[PDB]
């Protein structure tokens, strides 16, 4: 268009425009205070209004990158605060913005955000609602420079709904705190899923990402033909490649073009896209990315005809292996939306290995004739883990299930630090409470999403501080074999028990006033140290020690009765 900034202002609207501009500047100038960014937003917005009134006005014909880069280089504190980022200003726009992207700090050293009191938040939300929501956008954008800015607007509007409803209820804290914990966890999980998917795209290559996209899209859109799914996978791969690069402009236009195409070909893709495609342009791609699974045609034949019993299995495979394997993934994924994506990739890799061996053997047809039998043990393994863990979760509670996982994982790998074993087991316990409530149709896909972000953060700290050879051996393994190995870990019999420290098991009455979360973490910390001290302790012996601890904590609310509890448990 003649004035691109005017076109953006008319499409997004003034409110969304200012919010997106605040996020854009906060992701590049992460160290500048909130008041400086509010001034920059008002200046860009006032300039955009001159272009809407007259697209032929001065500088209105410049590109968004030029206008943004020129405005980024007008900051007086650019040389002193960001240093090498000021050297980017001596380059032309094609190289200047790339120089800006290279200086985005994915891990800035900013202090933790502290949740204010409920009465303070509600008062602040009432006094100045706009700056309240803008402060949220500023703090999260500067801490996550690659966070998709429209998705950040999606969270900000949910905070507005949370404070609007809860600050007028009879009990504000009971209403607001569960919603804030939900928005906090989903926000941290969103940025964590983006970082993992971007890092996996650079390491494992584009082929592995397309294989993942084929499986997930075929589950999402089972009524679509393979040519349609393959066209969506190509566009989706291009979208993620650029969104991972950091250029917000190219990322958003790609997602806009993809959502526009999907909404224009609903009859060839899915029937569940009626609601998402009626939403505004800013919310299309985000909505489609979380659309519900469509129903399968139900008239789908078996896969043995095209992939097992046909005489041209090796011929069609030799013509284009990834296309043939992609068609195998497409057909298997559209028929099993209850499987996890990594499970479908597990079956595709098995079918790929089989064809490589069989198509070169003497009798290929007889060789891969029983390939589907290899898929059954691979499918039963996660299914039996879901039933085994959800049944154990049903007998116990969330806290008791977390303590059950603590003893299991401490015996298997006691070399891991105690706060890590506690934090991981608590998160794995929340995975069980969230996914075991779903029916079996959504249990395995639910577990995959939450386990992928928990197993990665377990090794996000273990890669910086290695302490176990078995843990780091399977976080360097393939992505489809990461979870199966963690389930295949065994008890370390060659582990000498840790020395008994009296100060470790020593407890004081200060834990009786602490919150429930604090008393649990303190009790769960001592449970790991007990297993590290006596890994050969039976489940019956361990329960007797835990039952005496719950009774001693109730009676002591000191050190005299604690000495008898240590000596009795040490026998
Ligand atoms: C910007 O914050 N300032 C606020 C305010 O609104 N705080 C809210 C509160 O308690 N919040 C929560 C959360 O739920 O923890 C959070 C946590 S969400 C989050 N935190 C991270 O560190 C991160 O990396 N990613 N994500 C997604 C953010 S602000 C909001 C405020 C209100 S009155 C006042 N004086 N300050
Ligand atoms: C039409 C798009 C085809 C995309 C390529 C599909 C290749 C399937 C390979 C299956 C095994 C992959 C395992 C892995 O990459 O981790
Ligand atoms: C201001 C600069 C960023 C503007 C991005 C707006 C893109 C909105 C639609 C993209 C999408 O489908 O999510
Ligand atoms: C979320 C990044 C892509 C945004 C555009 C979405 C286009 C349709 C995606 C369909 C759902 C895919 C979800 C997934 O692959 O995990
Ligand atoms: C915790 C709730 C039970 C989870 C069992 C393991 C499920 C693994 C599914 C993903 C995969 O295929 O590896
Ligand atoms: C520390 C080790 C943590 C291992 C977590 C494995 C993920 C859950 C798999 C289910 C299971 O086998 O118990």
From Swiss-Prot:
PROSITE patterns: ALBUMIN_1, ALBUMIN_2. The modification Phosphoserine is found at residues 3, 56, 63, 271, 417, 487. Its main location: secreted. Changing residue 61 to N: In Malmo-95/Dalakarlia. It comes from the Eukaryota. Glycans are attached at residues 10, 49, 135, 160, 197, 223, 231, 274, 279, 311, 315-316, 321, 349, 376, 411, 437, 442, 492, 523, 532, 534, 543, 563. The modification Phosphothreonine is found at residues 81, 418, 420. Zn(2+) binds at residues 65, 245, 247. Glycated in diabetic patients. Binds water, Ca(2+), Na(+), K(+), fatty acids, hormones, bilirubin and drugs. Its main function is the regulation of the colloidal osmotic pressure of blood. Major zinc transporter in plasma, typically binds about 80% of all plasma zinc. Major calcium and magnesium transporter in plasma, binds approximately 45% of circulating calcium and magnesium in plasma. Potentially has more than two calcium-binding sites and might additionally bind calcium in a non-specific manner. This is Albumin. It comes from Homo sapiens. The gene is ALB.
């Amino acid at each position: 268009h003649k004035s691109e900034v005017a076109h953006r202002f008319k499409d997004l609207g003034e409110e969304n425009f200012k919010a997106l501009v605040l996020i854009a500047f906060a992701q590049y100038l992460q160290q500048c205070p909130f008041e400086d960014h509010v001034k920059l937003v008002n200046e860009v917005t006032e300039f955009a209004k001159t272009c809407v009134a007259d697209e032929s006005a001065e500088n209105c014909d410049k590109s968004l990158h030029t206008l943004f880069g020129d405005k980024l280089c007008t900051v007086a504190t650019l040389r002193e605060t960001y240093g090498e980022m000021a050297d980017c200003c001596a380059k032309q726009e094609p190289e200047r913005n790339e120089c800006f992207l290279q200086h985005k700090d994915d891990n800035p050293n900013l202090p933790r955000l502290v949740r204010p009191e409920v009465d303070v938040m509600c008062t602040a939300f009432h006094d100045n609602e706009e700056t309240f929501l803008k402060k949220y956008l500023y703090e999260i954008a500067r801490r996550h420079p690659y966070f998709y800015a429209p998705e950040l607007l999606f969270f900000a509007k949910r905070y507005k709904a949370a404070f609007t409803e809860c600050c007028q209820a009879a009990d504000k804290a009971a209403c607001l705190l569960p919603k804030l914990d939900e928005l906090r966890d989903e926000g941290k999980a969103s940025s964590a899923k983006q970082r993992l998917k971007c890092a996996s795209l650079q390491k494992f290559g584009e082929r592995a990402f397309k294989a993942w996209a084929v499986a997930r899209l075929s589950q999402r859109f089972p009524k679509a033909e393979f040519a349609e799914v393959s066209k969506l996978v190509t566009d989706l791969t291009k979208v993620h490649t650029e969104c991972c690069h950091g250029d917000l402009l190219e990322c958003a236009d790609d997602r806009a073009d993809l959502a526009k195409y999907i909404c224009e070909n609903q009859d060839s893709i899915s029937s569940k896209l009626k609601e998402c495609c009626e939403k505004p342009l800013l919310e299309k791609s985000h909505c489609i990315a979380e659309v519900e699974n469509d129903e399968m045609p139900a008239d789908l034949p078996s896969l043995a005809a095209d992939f097992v019993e046909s005489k041209d299995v090796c011929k069609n495979y030799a013509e284009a292996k990834d296309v043939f394997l992609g068609m195998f993934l497409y057909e298997y994924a559209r028929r099993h939306p209850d499987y996890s994506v990594v499970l479908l990739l597990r079956l595709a890799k098995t079918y790929e290995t089989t064809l490589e061996k069989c198509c070169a053997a003497a009798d290929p047809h007889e060789c891969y004739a029983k390939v589907f039998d290899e898929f059954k043990p691979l499918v039963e393994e996660p299914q039996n883990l879901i039933k085994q863990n959800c049944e154990l979760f049903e007998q116990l509670g969330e806290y008791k299930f977390q303590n059950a996982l603590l003893v299991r994982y401490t015996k298997k790998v006691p070399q891991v630090s105690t706060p890590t074993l506690v934090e991981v087991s608590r998160n794995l316990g929340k995975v069980g409470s969230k996914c075991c409530k779903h029916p079996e149709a959504k249990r395995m896909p639910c577990a995959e999403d939450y386990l992928s972000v928990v197993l990665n953060q377990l090794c996000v700290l273990h890669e910086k501080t290695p302490v176990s050879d078995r843990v780091t051996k399977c976080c360097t393994e393939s992505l489809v074999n990461r979870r199966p190995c963690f389930s295949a870990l065994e008890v370390d019999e060659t582990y000498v028990p840790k020395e008994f420290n009296a100060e470790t098991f020593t407890f004081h009455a200060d834990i009786c006033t602490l919150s429930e979360k604090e008393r649990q973490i303190k009790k769960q910390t001592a449970l790991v140290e007990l297993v590290k001290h006596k890994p050969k302790a039976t489940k019956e012996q361990l329960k007797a020690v835990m039952d005496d601890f719950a009774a001693f904590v109730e009676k002591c609310c000191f050190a005299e009765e604690g000495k008898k509890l240590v000596a009795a448990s040490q026998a």
